[PDB]
Homo-oligomer: A and B are copies of this chain.
Amino acid sequence: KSSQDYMNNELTYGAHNYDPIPVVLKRGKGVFVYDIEDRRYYDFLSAYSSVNQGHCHPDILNAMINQAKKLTICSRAFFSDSLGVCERYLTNLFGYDKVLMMNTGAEASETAYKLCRKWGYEVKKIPENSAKIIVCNNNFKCKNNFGPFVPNFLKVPYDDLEALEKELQDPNVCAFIVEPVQGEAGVIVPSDSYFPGVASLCKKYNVLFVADEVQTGLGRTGKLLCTHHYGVKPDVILLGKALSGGHYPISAILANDDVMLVLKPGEHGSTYGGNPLAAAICVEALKVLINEKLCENADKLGAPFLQNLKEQLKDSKVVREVRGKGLLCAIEFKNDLVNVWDICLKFKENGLITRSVHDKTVRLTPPLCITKEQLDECTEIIVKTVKFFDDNL
């Protein structure tokens, strides 16, 4: 069987709900993945930050096996030894009274909305009929906006304190939920000064500052929390992805007692949320992150890589911009001139796989254990692949 046998097999037995780059992987180790035909590629997506520690990290796999021999799941009908150990681990490590463990990052966001709204009722006296959470324009009037007839989410521009303050004036806002750097918007970094302002603004209007660190956290930008960079402490933290080194779906919300204690019991979530197996894996995944100093590696190698790449592409007709912080980087192209999807196929050909976002911005997010030498080899691949297209206009 060949890569193609597999790709056809999937098309005929599975739903067509995804549109993958045509490579079929069978193995990962650290910063490399390997296809059906034993070709090797640099993984520059890291399963969207789930394998910050690197593919198939042995320590984590170990933790997983030690737990899975004892107990894999018992459900929230009862207690496990493992979950508490995790909860205590995470809380001490991030400096929050409590933590709530879950599976997917969506579960994290949903639960966060419930949380903010209820805190808004129980504490700030706002009616759930009328509670609003501010978010940002992941991209960029006539509308009932008053009392019970309200949007649920108010969108405002990212990196915009004036606009943010304008909405915070609404007494029915209970929360601003924001990413330390916008992933989906194409890796948009904020001005150093934004988050400091955000923290003040929220403090002042008595509104929960929630930071979505599902992509930006756990080493990706150089720190355990990207928000650590701007010296601000959010009221609520969302964690996920790299929280497990790709060995399990695990995500979390962190908050102090005054926020977390708004949550009433009996309200069902997922059966697998907070299971012993995940709890064990979680602690090891973060222990690996800290012991191997992967945060610092990222911090040290990141700014250079980005700067040097900015240099070597300064004279490209198709490149629009090169952005990043730590090892969370991207290249935005002028989709007027090039087809972003082809650039991704070209990369794949040149030995580095990644994916598009907007059909204009390409994600550059390798596992955090990458070496200076490896990054240099990749800069070569990147400069070369971009050359290919520049050489057609």
Q: Interface on A for B, CB 8 Å cutoff?
A: 3, 6-7, 9-10, 12-28, 33, 36, 43, 45, 47-48, 50-51, 55-56, 61, 64-65, 68-85, 87-88, 90-91, 97-101, 103-107, 241, 245-249, 253, 260-261, 263-272, 274-277, 353-355
Contacts and interface: CB of A to CB of B under 8 A. Distances in A.
Contacts of A267: 17
Contact of A17 (B64, B71, B88, B269): B269
A355 B28 contact: no
B83 A14 contact: yes
Given A14-B99, A103-B249, A7 B79 contact: yes
19 contacts: A3-B79, A9-B84, A13-B98, A14-B84, A14-B87, A16-B264, A17-B263, A17-B269, A18-B76, A18-B266, A20-B78, A20-B79, A21-B77, A24-B81, A43-B74, A61-B68, A65-B65, A68-B247, A106-B107
A241 B17 contact: no
A338 to B, nearest CB: 19
Given A14-B87, A68-B64, A71-B56, A270 B81 contact: no
One complex includes copies of this chain to the number of 2
Which 4 pairs, one residue from A and one from B, show the smallest C-beta to C-beta distance?
A: A19-B265, A13-B87, A15-B100, A73-B246
Of A85, A98, A276, A277, the most chain B CB neighbours within 10 A belong to A98
B14 A47 contact: no
Given A14-B100, A83-B10, A56 B72 contact: yes
A65 B73 CA distance: 17
A249 B246 contact: no
Nearest to A245: B72
Contacts of A101: 14
Given A7-B79, A15-B99, A47-B77, 10 more contacts: A13-B91, A13-B99, A14-B84, A16-B260, A16-B264, A25-B79, A68-B247, A72-B245, A104-B271, A249-B272
A331 to B, nearest CB: 16
A103 B275 CA distance: 14
B247 A270 contact: no
Given A6-B84, A81-B36, A271-B50, A71 B14 contact: no
A339 to B, nearest CB: 16
B274 A6 contact: no
Contacts of A26: 70-71, 80-82
